[PDB]
Design a binder for this molecule. Sequence first.
Ligand SMILES: *SCC1=C(CS*)C(C)(C)N(O)C1(C)C
Ligand SMILES: [Cl-]
Ligand SMILES: [Cl-]
Ligand SMILES: [Cl-]
Ligand SMILES: [Cl-]
Ligand SMILES: [K+]
Ligand SMILES: [K+]
Length: 164
Amino acid sequence: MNIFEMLRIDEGLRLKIYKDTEGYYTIGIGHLLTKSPSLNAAKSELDKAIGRNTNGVITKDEAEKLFNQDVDAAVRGILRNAKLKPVYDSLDAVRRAALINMVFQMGETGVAGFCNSLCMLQQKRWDEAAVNLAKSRWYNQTPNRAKRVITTFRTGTWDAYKNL
Ligand SMILES: *SCC1=C(CS*)C(C)(C)N(O)C1(C)C
Ligand SMILES: [Cl-]
Ligand SMILES: [Cl-]
Ligand SMILES: [Cl-]
Ligand SMILES: [Cl-]
Ligand SMILES: [K+]
Ligand SMILES: [K+]
């Protein structure tokens, strides 16, 4: 297991535009296109992202290219973020993947909204952090994914992604 495999499990793979869990047009492995309700706006964003006129359909290779860019940008963003970098740097590689997963799903600003949990993680109070992480909109709206991510933070293992 690694961050790519983990996010592939949590995000799926779809080659046509679809709506994510929040109703927003997305493609590939969780590549958000736009929050606009306009499908034509989403199709325009897709063509810009891929560099050709796609009409809403891409190949697996193209989905994986966007995914690699998105993972890279998430990590680089964490490192540029004065709130998230110290916590990231304090963690082992498995827990780092859980943090990247959260940032991929909700963005840097959203994860910075988890400061109470982030402090507990930085202090390596793993069970306390896990309890606090679940007191969130995130957990309520995507509980199965959140439970996997939280187990990864609690244990520092890949156990939640083993049967999957
Ligand atoms: S998210 C709140 C913050 C933490 C965790 S306790 C810390 C890394 C120490 N950081 O400076 C804050 C104030 C942003
Ligand atoms: Cl892009
Ligand atoms: Cl296709
Ligand atoms: Cl708590
Ligand atoms: Cl879920
Ligand atoms: K998804
Ligand atoms: K995403």
